[PDB]
Each structure stands twice: as C-alpha cells, then as structure tokens.
Design a protein around this ligand. Sequence first.
Ligand SMILES: C[C@H]1CCCC(=O)CCC/C=C/c2cc(O)cc(O)c2C(=O)O1
Ligand SMILES: C[C@H]1CCCC(=O)CCC/C=C/c2cc(O)cc(O)c2C(=O)O1
Lengths: 263, 263
Amino acid sequence: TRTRGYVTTKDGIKWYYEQEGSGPDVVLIPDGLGECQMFDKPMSLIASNGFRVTTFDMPGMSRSSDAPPETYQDITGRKLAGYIITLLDTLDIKIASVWGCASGASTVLALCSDYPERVRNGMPHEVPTENPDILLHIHEVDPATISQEMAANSRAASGNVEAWDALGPEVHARLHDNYPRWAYGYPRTIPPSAPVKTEDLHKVPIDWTVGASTPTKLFFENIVIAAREGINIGTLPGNHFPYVSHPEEFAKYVVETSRKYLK
Amino acid sequence: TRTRGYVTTKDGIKWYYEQEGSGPDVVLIPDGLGECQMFDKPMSLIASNGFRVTTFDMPGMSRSSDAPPETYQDITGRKLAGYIITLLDTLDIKIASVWGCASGASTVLALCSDYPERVRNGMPHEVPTENPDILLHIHEVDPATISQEMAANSRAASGNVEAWDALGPEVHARLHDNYPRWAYGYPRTIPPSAPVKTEDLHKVPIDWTVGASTPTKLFFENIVIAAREGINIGTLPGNHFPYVSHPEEFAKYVVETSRKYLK
Ligand SMILES: C[C@H]1CCCC(=O)CCC/C=C/c2cc(O)cc(O)c2C(=O)O1
Ligand SMILES: C[C@H]1CCCC(=O)CCC/C=C/c2cc(O)cc(O)c2C(=O)O1
C-alpha cells in the first residue's frame, strides 16, 4: 500500500518519500518545484500495473526542506543524481526506470551518464538547455515577487489549470515556499550543465519527451539532439507537468515505455 | 511599384497574382487559406531589398476562386507544385527562392523534389505530416460550421491576433469563403502526400522553419525529419502565419536566407 515517511541520509538530507506497489522499480523524480504530491494519482496507476514506484520531495523543497543549503544551491543534474543515488541505496533500490521533468530531466540523464548501471531506462522530459526570457532575471528579485511570478508561470504551464488548481491548498502553500529557493539554486546552473553530450546519451536506454502543447521554441533543442543521436523522442499530452495534467496518459507512457526493457 | 492582375492558365485556373521589385525571383506561396494579401507588407520589404517578389491567391481561393473543381480538391503538394510551375512559366520566372507554410510548405518541398531546376532554395514552414484532432472531421460538416470553426482556429494559430484582425474585413470576408473549400480538399490529402522522404530533400538547399510559439506536437516531426536529414532547421517568431504576425522578422529571414544562395 502507499507508504509515506522520512529518512535522513548520510549527506544531511531529511527526505520525504513515498512508495507503493511491488515489482520492478520506477523512480519518479520531480521537476524543479520538487513536489512529489504531483505524482500522487499516476503513482497509484503505475504501481497497479505491477511496479514498485518510488518518489520523494526534492532536497530543500517541500517536506524535504530540512536539508543542507548546498543541496539546493548551485544545482546541476549531476549534483542531484549524487543525492538520488545515495537515497536509492538506503531504500535498497539497485536498478530503476527513472522519470524526470525539467531539472529532473537533467537528473535522469546525469544518472544515465554517471550511474548507468542503476538505470534500466531513463525517461527525460523537457531538458533545460536554454532558459526562456521570463527566467533570465528570476534569481535577481525578491522572494515574494518570485512566488507571485513563478506561481503564474507554473500555473500557465500546467497544461490543465483545473487539475493544477485541484492539487489543493496544502500543496500550493508548499509550492509557494519552494518557488524562491528554486530560483536561487536552479535556473542559472541547470541549463549549462545539461548532460546532452554524445557521451551522456548512449550508455543505457533513453526515451525522450516534450510537452505536446509546449511552445516549440522552449525545448526545440531537445528534439534536435535526440534526432541527431538516434534517441527515441516524442510528445506527451500537456506541457511541463504531464503527470498532473494528464495522469492516465502519463502513467500509460511510463508503463508502456518501461515495459519494453524488462528481462 | 506593385503590379496586380490575373492570368488564366492552360489548366483553366484564373490566377490572381501580384509582383513587385527587381532582381532575382522570390516566390511566396500562401498557406492553405490561399490569401496572398497576408504577404502585403513583407512583400514590400523583401522587394526593396533587391528582389522581384511574386505571390498569388491559390487556386479556388480568394481572387483565384474561379478555378476548376479539381484544382482545389484532393490537394497534394505535388498538384499545387504542378499548377505553380505552369503559372511561373507564363510569368517568365525560371528559378526562384520559394517560401511556403503548411500546404504551401508541402508545395515548396514538392517543387524542390520534382522541379529542382526551378528552385534556388526552399523555405518550408510547418509541413503538415499529421493533423491535430481539431481537423479530423472538418471535411465532414457543413460550410457555415467550418467557417465558424476554422476562423477561430486560424485566429488562435495566428501568432498575433491584433494583426490577424488587422488584415481587415475584406480579407476576412474572402477567408470566410475559403474555409470550407480548404476543408473539403486539403486536410485529408495534404499530410499523407508530404514530400519529406530522403530523396525529396537533397536536390536544392532547404531552410526549414517552425513557429516559435506553435505547440510542439503540431510540427514536431518536421524538426525530427530535418535533424535526421541534416537539413537546416530553426524557428520563426509566432505560430502558423509569421508573415502576418511578424512582417519585418519574416522578411528579414527570407531576404537573408535567399541572398546566401546567389551567385
Ligand atoms: C520550476 C519548473 C517549472 C517552471 C515552469 C516554467 O516557468 C516554464 C519554463 C521552463 C523552464 C523550466 C526550468 C528551467 C531551468 O533552467 C531549471 C528548472 O529546474 C526548470 C524547472 O524545473 O521548471
Ligand atoms: C488552413 C491552414 C491554417 C488553419 C489553422 C489551423 O487549423 C492550424 C492547424 C495546423 C494544421 C494546418 C493544415 C493541415 C493540413 O492537413 C492541411 C493544411 O492546408 C493546413 C493548413 O494550411 O492550415
């Protein structure tokens, strides 16, 4: 059944994490906002397809907020993979299908490249390689301003405002606090460290996606890199948060995608 | 400086065309709506950068609506390419830099494939290779419903609704009659006919664009095929009508792209 709890790791981080189901492992890493409650409904669905699903709030974010300051500053996919790895060890997850959007997509690839042996297959979605105009000075302003701004930016990029609002008051209060921390630690340093070099993308299976309704320019490069490299590239319904806006379809893609690599 | 007129070709089409400027030929093929008045400003800008610019209302559309039934039904890029060659011959245009969006883009590629001796360089924009669900039954309904649905869809996909509205009432009155005719003859046949096979794309230079704001899924495959084929691919500001939403940027792109293939 769904287990909800904490575990503190050797690196200082008090992770909030959730688990459900049984079978082969699926890890659901959050996008930059670090809020694993976005995964709630799809988590049940994947699990019920014969999977053990793991997810967690990200370091410094939400209920994982009791963490060391460096674990949410100067963030890269590789920094994040390091922490995920040491968390997976405590949970005895040896090999996993790994999903992530945004900076969490940065993390998928970082793991695919740096810890290939722990990735059965990586599912990155919208790897930041250039930030849009709206983020260029997001780290320069005040917390309240960022929370006001980033809540509308995320809300607009929800891909389904009904479902985005429907995440609820508890979640959006947590998100209100993550927004500022996210701006100070993620936007500048995530795109330039995107592991999309040739030598990152071929050590294990990768199925790349982009949001169906995301404006082409935002992750245009994602599609060209994947095509050039012969990496499976496609879309999913919605935009930046398919697991929230289109939970069923998202959970079907994870299931379908992971399915083809099981042996 | 600008000439406007008609020419009935041996295939029975009564073409409305416009020319302006002097020098190497640039041909601007409309999108599915077939309304060459959308090219008014860009056509002025391009021509004074030292080009003879030609455009036209597409067969059966707008001021070229006096055309035989076959010329606006079961439409493919290749059929459109065939009528346009026939028209180009009668205007003594031997070789041209050619732009086109949508089914215009289809025609650009079909021109690049089957009439390579006529193309200096190809500028396709948003080649339809599949349809969004919004068009899947558009050929099945009555005209007034199509005109109501398709005006909003094109307005929504305009890239800049102010300037779309600013095309004026006379332009939109012609579009009103173009919608059903486009729906009955284009959607079903254009995508399956897309000349995007390997042998279609390496006879003349191709510079491929997709609207910066356009939902990724709409022309996602365009970016894949171009990246796979080593064909230059980029974005333009806006969506489906970059010549309407951003005249100056559009004309700069066309001018500079084509200049680079003069000799
Ligand atoms: C906060 C989240 C939703 C933010 C939604 C949003 O504003 C869309 C812009 C896309 C950029 C996302 C992004 C970019 C980065 O450089 C680093 C990131 O961690 C993210 C990212 O996680 O986006
Ligand atoms: C009418 C125009 C703008 C129509 C506005 C619009 O519906 C945007 C959707 C993109 C699809 C365009 C399209 C698809 C086809 O199969 C054939 C076409 O001729 C077009 C196309 O020309 O769309």
